[PDB]
């Protein structure tokens, strides 16, 4: 007997906040009654009109859960603004319509690692931190690098920086020394991709760079 | 018969260029005869006087090599200027005396890695590098950290950076996700120090950060 109310019904979900062009946008419609109490079951007529960039008309998929909740899923394939309007028998429900921003999404699986850094803090012979550079700083990356770039940098404030890029699959080990001695924790080992996928023709070799 | 000459004799070595306060300064005196020809044997009376900071008088250890060359080794324990003067009979040899700069040297073994970063370029569904951010970027570092700090940073230019500090002998696994999916190569193993000397009391735990 409790009938749905446009004024009280409302929608919530990420699909109404921020959307990406490469993944489905989802949100939920919560049917509420004239009185102001959540609806107990389904069958209420809610429609969803979504208009995207350059007159795109998006077809939202609405699923009646039979709880008084309606799950909405829709694709937004073109970066831009998407006006979403959930109506109940033609009347916009609470906080509708709503403009929803869609941005180019990152396809996670297509990203890879490559660039890395680390900083090193030098201490003097008494155990006090240094306040200037001038030490022989050596960084030597051993591994099956297809491609490798490495810079050993004296920052001139008692700290040193290694900045490097790696392309390849395998086990890498980076020896870091100050005036001929390994720092605590060195060598720092890192696995890039999967060792088993290493090109057979590419063996492990050392690349050494030094400051001062 | 060939006799050594102050005017032609000369010295060369890192101990005359840059000295560290925690490593012996070494150089060689090249006794050259009166005609301009290297001395063939030893026994010439070379004297080394080295004056350091705040009136310090340093004791050089001169070693006759018996081939016209004399190895000099001295300690310069306080940073500052060290005036070195190699003489032969009261006369300074060629290019003497010479002021030499002593700087505080890093004790590599008492130094450490201060921080680490890695950067990932996000790619859209077209396979091109994104030119802005907004993706959910999650970074988790799991292992027996004695100390750890971490941040997952959206650089707002299509790339994302994990920035962290780590103290602890161990194997660490780092999971990096962009919009809920591991990037190629994630999770990946890193090793700092030697996992075998892990204190059994230090439990392996996860630290997670998320941008957007």
Swiss-Prot record, chains A, B:
Lineage: Eukaryota, Amoebozoa, Evosea, Eumycetozoa, Dictyostelia
Name recorded for this polypeptide: Gelation factor
Superkingdom, natural source: Eukaryota
Source organism of the structure: Dictyostelium discoideum (Social amoeba)
Recorded domain comment: The rod domain contains six 100-residue motifs that appear to have a cross-beta conformation.
Filamin repeats: 1-102, 118-192
Quaternary structure (record): Homodimer.
Residues of the full protein shown: 646 to 857 of 857
Function: F-actin cross-linking protein.
Residue numbers spanned by region Disordered: 187-212
């Amino acid at each position: 007997k409790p009938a749905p109310s446009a004024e009280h019904s409302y929608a919530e979900g990420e699909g109404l906040v921020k959307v990406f062009d490469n993944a489905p946008a989802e949100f939920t419609i919560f049917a509420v009654d004239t009185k102001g109490v959540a609806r107990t079951d389904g069958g209420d007529p809610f429609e969803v009109a979504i208009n995207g960039p350059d007159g795109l008309v998006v077809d939202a998929k609405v699923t009646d859960n039979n709880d008084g909740t309606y799950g909405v899923v829709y694709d937004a394939p073109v970066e831009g603004n998407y006006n979403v309007n959930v109506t109940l028998r033609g009347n916009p429900i609470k906080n509708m319509p709503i403009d929803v921003k869609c941005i180019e999404g990152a396809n996670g699986e297509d990203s890879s690692f490559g660039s890395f850094t680390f900083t090193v803090a030098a201490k003097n012979k008494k155990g006090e931190v240094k306040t200037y550079g001038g030490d022989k700083f050596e960084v030597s990356i051993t591994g099956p690098a297809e491609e490798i770039t490495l810079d050993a940098i004296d920052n001139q404030d008692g700290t040193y920086t290694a900045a490097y890029s790696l392309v390849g699959n395998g086990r890498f080990s980076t020896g870091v020394k100050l005036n001929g001695k390994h720092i605590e924790g060195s060598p720092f080992k890192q696995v890039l991709g999967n060792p088993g996928k290493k090109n057979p023709e590419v063996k492990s070799f050392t690349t050494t760079r030094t400051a001062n």
